[PDB]
Design a binder for these strands. Sequence first.
RNA 1: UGGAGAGUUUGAUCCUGGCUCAGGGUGAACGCUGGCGGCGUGCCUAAGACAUGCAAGUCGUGCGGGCCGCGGGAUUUUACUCCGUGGUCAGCGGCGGACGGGUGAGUAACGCGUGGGUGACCUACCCGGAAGAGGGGGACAACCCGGGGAAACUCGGGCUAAUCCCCCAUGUGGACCCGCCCCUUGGGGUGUGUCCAAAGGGCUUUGCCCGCUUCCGGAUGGGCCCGCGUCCCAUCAGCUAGUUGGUGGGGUAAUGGCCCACCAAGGCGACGACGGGUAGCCGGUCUGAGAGGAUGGCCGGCCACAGGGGCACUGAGACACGGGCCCCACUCCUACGGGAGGCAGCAGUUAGGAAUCUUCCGCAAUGGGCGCAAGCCUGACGGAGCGACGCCGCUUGGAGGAAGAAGCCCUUCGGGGUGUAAACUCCUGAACCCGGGACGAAACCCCCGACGAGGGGACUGACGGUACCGGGGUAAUAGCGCCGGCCAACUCCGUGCCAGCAGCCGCGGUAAUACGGAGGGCGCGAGCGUUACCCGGAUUCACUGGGCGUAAAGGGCGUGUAGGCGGCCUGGGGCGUCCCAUGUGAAAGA
Lengths: 99, 208, 99, 83
Amino acid sequence: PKKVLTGVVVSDKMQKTVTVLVERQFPHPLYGKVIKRSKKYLAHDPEEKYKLGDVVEIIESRPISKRKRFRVLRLVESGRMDLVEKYLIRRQNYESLSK
Amino acid sequence: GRYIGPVCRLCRREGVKLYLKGERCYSPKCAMERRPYPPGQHGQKRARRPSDYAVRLREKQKLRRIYGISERQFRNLFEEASKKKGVTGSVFLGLLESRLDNVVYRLGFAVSRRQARQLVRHGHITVNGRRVDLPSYRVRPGDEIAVAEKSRNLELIRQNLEAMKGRKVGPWLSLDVEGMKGKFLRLPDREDLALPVNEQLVIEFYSR
Amino acid sequence: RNLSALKRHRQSLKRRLRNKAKKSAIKTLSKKAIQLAQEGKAEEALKIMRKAESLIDKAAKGSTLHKNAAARRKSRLMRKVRQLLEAAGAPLIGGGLSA
Amino acid sequence: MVKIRLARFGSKHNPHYRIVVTDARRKRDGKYIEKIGYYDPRKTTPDWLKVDVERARYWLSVGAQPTDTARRLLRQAGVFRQE
RNA sequence: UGGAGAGUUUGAUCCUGGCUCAGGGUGAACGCUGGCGGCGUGCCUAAGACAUGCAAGUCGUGCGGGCCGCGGGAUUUUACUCCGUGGUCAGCGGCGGACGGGUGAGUAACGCGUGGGUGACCUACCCGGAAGAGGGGGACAACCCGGGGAAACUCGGGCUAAUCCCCCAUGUGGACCCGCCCCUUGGGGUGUGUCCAAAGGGCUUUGCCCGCUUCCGGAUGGGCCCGCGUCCCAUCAGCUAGUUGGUGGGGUAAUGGCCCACCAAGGCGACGACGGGUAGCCGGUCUGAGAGGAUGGCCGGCCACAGGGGCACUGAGACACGGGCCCCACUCCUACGGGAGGCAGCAGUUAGGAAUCUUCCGCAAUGGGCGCAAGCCUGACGGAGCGACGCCGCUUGGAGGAAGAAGCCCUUCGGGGUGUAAACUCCUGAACCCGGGACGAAACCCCCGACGAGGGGACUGACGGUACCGGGGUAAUAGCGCCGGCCAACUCCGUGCCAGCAGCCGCGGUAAUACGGAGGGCGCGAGCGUUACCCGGAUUCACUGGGCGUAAAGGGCGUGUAGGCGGCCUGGGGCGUCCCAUGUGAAAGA
Ligand SMILES: [Mg+2]
Ligand SMILES: [Mg+2]
Ligand SMILES: [Mg+2]
Ligand SMILES: [Mg+2]
Ligand SMILES: [Mg+2]
Ligand SMILES: [Mg+2]
């Protein structure tokens, strides 16, 4: 069955496209503890419809670009800017890590 | 393979009578009557207090030296016995005891295991009628172990099979003396054997 | 040191040539048709399309252009032509279009 | 064109074939689509030929050609024998 | 059904802790030694270079010729010409050359593994089903006649067949545009319009066989995409312009910045981007009590490569190991203009190296390509050969045989040891000789039947005069390591911190069970040792299963970012977690 993934929209800065952060969590093969881990997907939003902070389902799809390979199936809930907030700060930590 | 050298000479060293000659090892020596001590220049100086290791060694030496099977072959049989279901110490005994060359001897067709082994190599033995020249051949229960009718003549087959006329035989064996043949009824139960040998120690020698 | 199936080469060359040839017609004729529609030509622009259509189908009879590379070409062409004609006036006479 | 054919198992001077459906192009002893029988030419056992005839009939139904010698064995187990 | 530890820091002790040994393994190599067989296995190094032979063809039942024959005819005049047939050689045309076989160079990646997606696709030959093949026309090799080149070869001119190419027809049908319906990514259905088929051959000749064409399905094989998984270095921290997305093209069988134009300004990264190193991945293999560690040779699956680098053509399929073009490096021929070539196919040579095989036999079997078949091709393969490289089986005798030869060794001079060992008696009879002698092979095919089912018949064995069976028959090979402790096995000489041993601890300075020899002893045995490498023990990277006051180890102290962790009660949800069913988990291996 075409994979269905649910995540948070963290970018509408592209035409007909959204970046979706999908968290995943599981037992660590050796050390046991349940650990989180995530991935951004670029998903197809043809009616520039879903916006920054929406939770969406993402569905395994016939390719649209190099790297566009999922389409936005539906919307789960609006608003969730905390999640976007989380991602953004984590992103800015990065400056405070080089030389 | 197989040993070939001085023998009622470990009837010695291993401390105890192995009948390896059999015929003589019954009568004023397995060499072991005249000198019940280890061989060589030192063999009757005061016994060294032997190590936990030494002990385990000699004991397996003893057991193996009884059936004159070689270390390689002995070891394979043991590993076979370990991985097999049931009490490994015993099973091993069952298995050594299933070697044709030993059974040929247990049935009395020969007076020793080394002599028995030759009768097997030289075509003098059958199993269920069909001929078999492998000492290592595994005898299973129900198998009939004949002298080869062609061999039934020789001064040896005569003498030994005659000698058996009076003789009693293994609870796990049967032997029709007249028709020069035996049956292998079941594999021997530890109790059926009277071996001068503590097998639990042998198992122990194959730990470390 | 003399493998007699370099005969395969000899034929390949002949075939290469026969193909090259068929395809050249197809291109130069399609060009011609869509050029004519770009100028709003009922009769003449379809008249030619109709030939090109045919010439393609024929090409797909054997090895040249087999398949539905055929089909692709036909589609692309009778889209192009059709649109270009309504992009000017004039609709009618003849042709391989379902009106 | 897929095939019912022989596939060599066993050992040296000890052939045992497996009767297998497989693509024509595939190596002799390679990956097959189904085992559907076996065959020991030296008949060393009572059990020297065996064929899943319902299965043989299916593959034939979908158009696999047996080797000449495969069909020999097939017939012998009565794949073709009718009414 | 599974888990052993020991030596070594001190005068002694307990503890930390490293080093070391005992076990298992190997595509090994090296030393001493070496009898037989079966089954495995054998360039780990230079993906260095390669002499020679062989490794892919086949079809005359698609077609027309050339050359060498033979035989019939027309004329009764011998020239000229028609027909039939046998060699043989290519050519046109098909199907195969994309499989099979080789290697691991590159590749850290959708390459591989595993589970999914394709409404985004392809599939020659095979099977099933529906419907067809009616007219015309053409050319290019062969062959013939010329020219250029040393050679490779090559340029022109003329003739000609076909299942070669084209045109018109028929349109079961299918393709495309537009519409409408169902369905939902480009999936079905339908209506105008347009467009698209074909090839003949054989005959046991009016009726069958091999083919051809369109289309719908099947089967097998493949492309593309996605989730998850997949080594070392952070003393590599920022990276990115087809870059990230878009709209429209192009290209493909098909999606896609795959490619292009135009617009937008984006994408990626401490959950490690980028960079560097190393590396084919897996099924498995070895080891371990297990968790784990290590590994990917043989066999099977996938990938990638074919002197190095580009690239396309042809085709169902290749961007093609034994096809093509160009650049480069090499070797060869050259009449100096130019040409030929590519063992990581089987053998084999040479180089490198500690080291790795026969220029064997056969298409008899299995499997593959073409063929209606007979058949042909097949260094795939089935065998044999070399190497104790590995595993397994077997031999070098068996029973007698002294209070116990000789020699050698010890000796408190009584004796003690090698030792039932030898001698010697009988017995058996590896080797070797004679006789017979396989299975592996019943199909294709032919006959009967009906070219079906079924029945009958014949041909065929490289291994091989081998295996195996019967008869005869000789007492017929033993080596290597070790004996201070760990670790099984002790004595005499020699030697004097020398010569030497040595895995660790340590032996040797004139009485050495530790060096060298000898007697004797322990261990294993056609082997035994050594070196290298992997796991073990090592709970010594500690998830299972470790630690940090003085043994190595708390950051000089705070603040608080990410992150990790989170009191008590109730309700929803059901992501984690748990349960049932089910699919998957190929074969090999276990
Ligand atoms: Mg010390
Ligand atoms: Mg100290
Ligand atoms: Mg000390
Ligand atoms: Mg220690
Ligand atoms: Mg510690
Ligand atoms: Mg400290």
